[PDB]
Design an enzyme around this catalytic site. Structure first.
Site, PDB file in Angstrom:
ATOM      1  N   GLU B  35     -17.202  52.581  32.211  1.00 48.21           N
ATOM      2  CA  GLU B  35     -16.627  51.236  32.230  1.00 48.21           C
ATOM      3  C   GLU B  35     -15.327  51.189  33.015  1.00 48.21           C
ATOM      4  OE1 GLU B  35     -16.365  49.948  28.070  1.00 48.21           O
ATOM      5  OE2 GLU B  35     -18.574  50.128  27.883  1.00 48.21           O
ATOM      6  N   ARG B  53     -24.031  56.376  25.344  1.00 48.11           N
ATOM      7  CA  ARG B  53     -25.217  55.893  24.657  1.00 48.11           C
ATOM      8  C   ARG B  53     -25.812  54.778  25.532  1.00 48.11           C
ATOM      9  NH1 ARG B  53     -23.699  50.755  23.100  1.00 48.11           N
ATOM     10  NH2 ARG B  53     -21.464  50.404  22.776  1.00 48.11           N
TER      11      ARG B  53
HETATM   12 MG   LIG Z   1     -15.995  49.458  26.333  1.00 46.92          MG
END
Ligand SMILES: [Mg+2]
Ligand SMILES: [Mg+2]
Ligand SMILES: [Mg+2]
Ligand SMILES: [Mg+2]
Lengths: 130, 130
Positions: B35, B53
């Site tokens: 991210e 995940r």
């Molecule tokens: Mg996050």
């Protein structure tokens, strides 16, 4: 099924050339299907007929080409030119196969009762996606 | 949304290169998400976290790449090598974007009641596909 899985790349291009010949010869407007029989013994193709409309099996072609055939039909009849963005149809060189698809119609034809369609109230219907 | 529609190709590839660095440095096994924050004023990217995940939004990625993430997780833990047909995963050079997708989660959160989730019996449910 789309594409036809038993064809070579050569047979695939052979058929495509025949279909453009037929479509051009009839100045065809819209969506249509050019049907062949293939002799599995010899590999020869033989034109049978044109279905001058959308077909129940259009969906397998939409999924492997990414081209919405119904929106294409609408734009074509609005006067759009194939290959422009407003047609919803790429130029030929940008039309590609991506993977493989098959489609089935689920009906109430009961295989255990000679395919006589069953009728009445559906008490539960849950589809499966993913 | 997949891909991120505000990115250029160059930005898209810069981000991919950072992510591959993180993955390799962590010897990552399975599916994960790297991210970033992107500063809208400068176009600068900033690494925030890896989510180790599958995520609820994996679906948009699957539809634009054609790659089943969950099957890939399974083959990978079975010992398959990415790049082989058995892995369910193409080599990097054969992974590509095809169109654009978005995902919406429909919930019982009521916009008429400050998004407090509702509850009770569902009296009617019909999804829409096509
Ligand atoms: Mg996050
Ligand atoms: Mg026919
Ligand atoms: Mg006929
Ligand atoms: Mg987190």
């Amino acid at each position: 099924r789309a594409p036809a899985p038993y064809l070579s790349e050569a047979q695939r291009q052979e058929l495509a050339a025949y279909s453009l010949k037929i479509a051009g010869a009839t100045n065809y407007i819209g969506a249509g299907t050019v049907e062949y029989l293939m002799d599995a013994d010899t590999g020869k193709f033989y034109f049978i007929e044109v279905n001058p409309r959308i077909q129940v099996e259009h969906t397998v072609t939409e999924v492997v080409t990414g081209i919405d055939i119904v929106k294409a039909q609408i734009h074509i009849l609005d006067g759009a030119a194939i290959g422009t963005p407003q047609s919803g149809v790429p130029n030929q060189e940008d039309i590609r196969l991506n993977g493989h698809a098959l489609q089935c119609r689920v009906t109430t034809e009961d295989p255990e009762h000679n395919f006589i369609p069953d009728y009445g109230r559906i008490t539960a219907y849950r589809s499966a996606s993913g």
